[PDB]
Design a binder for this molecule. Sequence first.
Ligand SMILES: CC(C)(NS(=O)(=O)c1ccc2c(Cl)cnc(NC(=N)N)c2c1)C(=O)O
Ligand SMILES: *[C@@H]1O[C@H](CO)[C@@H](O)[C@H](O)[C@H]1NC(C)=O
Ligand SMILES: [Ca+2]
Lengths: 242, 128
Amino acid sequence: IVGGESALPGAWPWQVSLHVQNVHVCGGSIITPEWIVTAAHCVEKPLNNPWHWTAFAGILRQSFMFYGAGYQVEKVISHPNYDSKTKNNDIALMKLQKPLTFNDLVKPVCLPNPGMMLQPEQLCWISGWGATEEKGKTSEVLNAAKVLLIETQRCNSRYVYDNLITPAMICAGFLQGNVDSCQGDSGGPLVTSKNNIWWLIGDTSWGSGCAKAYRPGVYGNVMVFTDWIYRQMRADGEFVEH
Amino acid sequence: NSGIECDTCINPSNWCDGVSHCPGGEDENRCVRLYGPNFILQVYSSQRKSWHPVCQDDWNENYGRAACRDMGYKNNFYSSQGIVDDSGSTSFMKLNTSIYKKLYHSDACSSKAVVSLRCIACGVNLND
Ligand SMILES: CC(C)(NS(=O)(=O)c1ccc2c(Cl)cnc(NC(=N)N)c2c1)C(=O)O
Ligand SMILES: *[C@@H]1O[C@H](CO)[C@@H](O)[C@H](O)[C@H]1NC(C)=O
Ligand SMILES: [Ca+2]
């Protein structure tokens, strides 16, 4: 997170660090005790198998994510219509073997409901352990930044992303740059407050550079993916019911 | 793009009608929805081809737990209370005690309230 600030305990209780080979690779958003919303580019082959992935919740610092605090991922579900190249439908779901114990440090984000009537430039928040500067390294402390939604019509301008923002994609940040998501915030929460409830509006998908002018952050539209999320969670509940 | 797609196309009167018609069941698994920042419980009407708010009339927590189960939240249940409907709705889904397909269409709600179903305690951080 470029342009942001060190996150406080419980500020983003949904934010999860997803690890492969004992290092942070992607962020995630706890939506249920066992389900995590992340990006589909995060779990592209060879990381499509759940065994590589361990989830760390309620820990703000990457160095405090020790052996024994991780939650092993049991199931990785990439969006069926995810395109590696356009990164359209860049949403994935990670189930955890061990359900997460919800507290004030670990808590779910609300899945967006139809009819949120969000503002064209809705103040949203982006959290993650990603780079604090472009081409930079994974951050130690969980960072977060206020970002405003950029209407897709404005984000699809030739001077911004030139028709590369699909309906399964939402733009957030600032057209001046300075404050954006970056390497390692992938799959992380683009969340807004409404009705004193935080809503997962997007998962960190892509963007050209980090915090560059006219190059904002592009997030997978979780609203468009809610049906797929509900279907995948219900199917898992039905399958393990047996 | 003539009716409802399953990713197979379905006549919207066969969408959410109780009989699984897509091979992946997509027509019968996304029939309950929460609407708006107030979690207004909604059920899709196969007949009216529209999403409609569930009335709080004779609605108990097990019906909410069931709608929560039908939305993929399994045994997760936080809150089900009645609220004024802000979904801008004119037709409503009322319970015939004699989730979806257990409701019928009414244009009023005797309680004057729709179901606000919260399947999971989410969306709360350290700052209210
Ligand atoms: C063009 C390229 C390859 N970009 S990037 O640095 O590698 C990068 C990687 C991941 C991102 C994520 Cl996950 C989310 N958002 C981003 N961008 C933004 N503006 N919010 C990202 C940017 C470069 O190196 O020039
Ligand atoms: C309730 O169901 C029974 C028949 O199944 C009947 O009393 C009535 O038609 C239904 N209720 C309404 C008002 O639709
Ligand atoms: Ca059907």
